[PDB]
Scaffold this motif. Structure first.
Motif, PDB file in Angstrom:
ATOM      1  N   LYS A 162      12.472   4.677  -1.337  1.00  0.00           N
ATOM      2  CA  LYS A 162      11.072   3.932  -1.940  1.00  0.00           C
ATOM      3  C   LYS A 162      10.836   4.525  -3.223  1.00  0.00           C
ATOM      4  N   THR A 215       1.123  -1.412   0.291  1.00  0.00           N
ATOM      5  CA  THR A 215      -0.069   0.235  -0.032  1.00  0.00           C
ATOM      6  C   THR A 215       0.714   1.355  -0.186  1.00  0.00           C
ATOM      7  N   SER A 216       0.791   2.093  -0.628  1.00  0.00           N
ATOM      8  CA  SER A 216       1.142   3.763  -0.600  1.00  0.00           C
ATOM      9  C   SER A 216       0.575   4.715   0.220  1.00  0.00           C
ATOM     10  N   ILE A 217       0.986   5.081   1.505  1.00  0.00           N
ATOM     11  CA  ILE A 217       0.604   6.386   2.486  1.00  0.00           C
ATOM     12  C   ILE A 217       1.700   6.563   2.576  1.00  0.00           C
ATOM     13  N   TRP A 218       1.500   8.437   2.547  1.00  0.00           N
ATOM     14  CA  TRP A 218       1.727   9.334   2.613  1.00  0.00           C
ATOM     15  C   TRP A 218       0.857  10.098   3.086  1.00  0.00           C
ATOM     16  N   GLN A 242       5.243   3.581  -7.540  1.00  0.00           N
ATOM     17  CA  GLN A 242       3.591   2.829  -6.245  1.00  0.00           C
ATOM     18  C   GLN A 242       3.374   4.600  -6.723  1.00  0.00           C
ATOM     19  N   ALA A 290       6.000   7.923   5.589  1.00  0.00           N
ATOM     20  CA  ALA A 290       5.814   7.604   4.690  1.00  0.00           C
ATOM     21  C   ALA A 290       5.810   5.769   5.115  1.00  0.00           C
TER      22      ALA A 290
HETATM   23 CL    CL Z   1       4.396   4.598   1.734  1.00  0.00          CL
END
Ligand code: CL
Ligand code: CA
Ligand code: CL
Length: 379
Positions: A321, A72-75, A356, A97
């Motif tokens: 990343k 999962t891409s979380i920022w 991502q 991140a």
């Molecule tokens: Cl992330």
């Protein structure tokens, strides 16, 4: 093999053209070789056994380009103000991140919650969606929504301000002939701009008089209109229900909520965040505004915060990343600085795979390092 490390000097050397060249880092070497190579340890001996040229590569490049990502891409971007009970409050910006640990002490803004914020002299009010322009000095407005006179707006960062989407003013919609007699057959008391009420199943329903009819208004809007201009009316005069059934009902588009608004206390909840996450499975991303006691991460994750050389944020990464922005590609190193990767082939030469999706509203806040390009790593 055209990549060597002197076991003593630890200096990287790359054979190109026909002779050896000292190279700044592993990134620059894989850039010029065209493949994600790995160095071969050699004694100082065989180095001298062949000619040497000028130093090659990119100094500002990361040593390598490792990646540790989802799934999962979380920022998430956060603003923390210490000395919030001062004059004189100081803002701390954090870019996160990694997986977030959201709880009751740090969660999205409720519908009835809001944060008073000041940016470049003007004040903004932040809701669950985003920010609204609000007149700080308008005491008729603020006291109508029950904003404490003790409530101080707290400075927001450029990053958080740009991150928070504008949702419009806040602020009442204007009424043209406010004060002039109504052309509706209503009594002389109810000039346009005035407020009256009719008792219903749920008690009082409030109406503002408009140039082309009447309009249902919430108590917060009703109390506001009177506060700025009461038109000599002590209280909204009671009107018998049958007297208005044949008056054209209009729409008065007030942004003022039905609910009384809890204005969060910055000393209690110093954290204001804009979180972003995509499941990496189709659909669109999901974003929301967070508010609470601290950053939405584990207590020990605080040890991973790195303050940049000259950037605006403290970054929190659980590894390097590789992302795709609005479509431009950037590699992020364990120290939280972004490097532009111009194309796919360049990325493949680095051994970088599958970017991502990340929001530019946050990645922008990182220190922009030198572009990792084929032409650049040659010197
Ligand atoms: Cl992330
Ligand atoms: Ca909360
Ligand atoms: Cl994604």
């Amino acid at each position: 093999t055209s990549l060597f490390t002197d076991r003593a000097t630890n200096q990287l050397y790359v054979l190109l053209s026909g002779q050896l060249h000292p190279v700044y880092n592993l990134t620059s070497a894989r850039l010029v070789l065209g493949n994600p190579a790995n160095p071969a340890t050699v004694k100082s001996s065989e180095l001298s056994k062949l000619p040497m040229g000028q130093t090659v590569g990119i100094p500002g490049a990361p040593y390598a380009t490792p990646v540790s990502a989802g799934s999962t891409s979380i920022w998430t971007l956060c603003d923390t103000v210490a000395r919030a009970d001062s004059t004189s409050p100081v803002v701390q910006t954090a870019v996160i991140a990694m997986p977030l640990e959201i709880d009751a002490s740090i969660d999205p803004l409720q519908s009835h919650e809001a944060v008073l914020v000041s940016y470049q002299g003007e004040t903004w009010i932040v809701t669950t969606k985003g920010r609204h322009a609000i007149d700080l000095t308008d005491r008729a407005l603020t006291s109508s929504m029950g904003i404490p006179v003790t409530a101080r707006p707290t400075p927001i960062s450029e990053g958080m301000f740009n991150a928070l989407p504008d949702m419009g003013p806040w602020q009442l919609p204007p009424i043209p002939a406010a004060g002039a007699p109504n052309s509706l057959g209503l009594p002389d008391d109810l000039v346009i701009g005035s407020v009256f009420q009719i008792h219903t199943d749920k008690g009082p329903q409030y109406y503002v008089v408009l140039p082309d009819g009447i309009a249902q208004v919430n108590a917060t809007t009703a109390a506001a209109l009177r506060a700025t201009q009461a038109h000599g009316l002590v209280a909204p005069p009671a009107m018998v229900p049958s007297l208005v059934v044949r008056i054209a009902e209009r729409v008065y588009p007030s942004p003022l909520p039905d609910e009384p608004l809890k204005i969060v206390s910055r000393p209690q909840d110093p954290a204001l965040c804009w979180s972003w996450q995509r499941s990496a499975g189709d659909q669109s991303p999901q974003s929301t505004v967070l508010s609470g006691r601290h950053l939405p991460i584990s207590p020990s994750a605080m040890n991973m915060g790195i303050k940049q050389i000259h950037g605006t944020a403290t970054v929190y990464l659980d590894g390097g990343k590789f992302v795709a922005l609005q479509e431009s590609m950037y590699y992020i190193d364990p120290q939280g600085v972004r490097y532009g990767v111009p194309n796919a082939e360049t990325a493949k030469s680095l051994g970088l795979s599958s970017p991502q999706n990340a929001p530019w509203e946050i990645v922008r806040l990182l220190v922009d390092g030198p572009v990792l390009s084929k032409d650049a790593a040659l010197l």
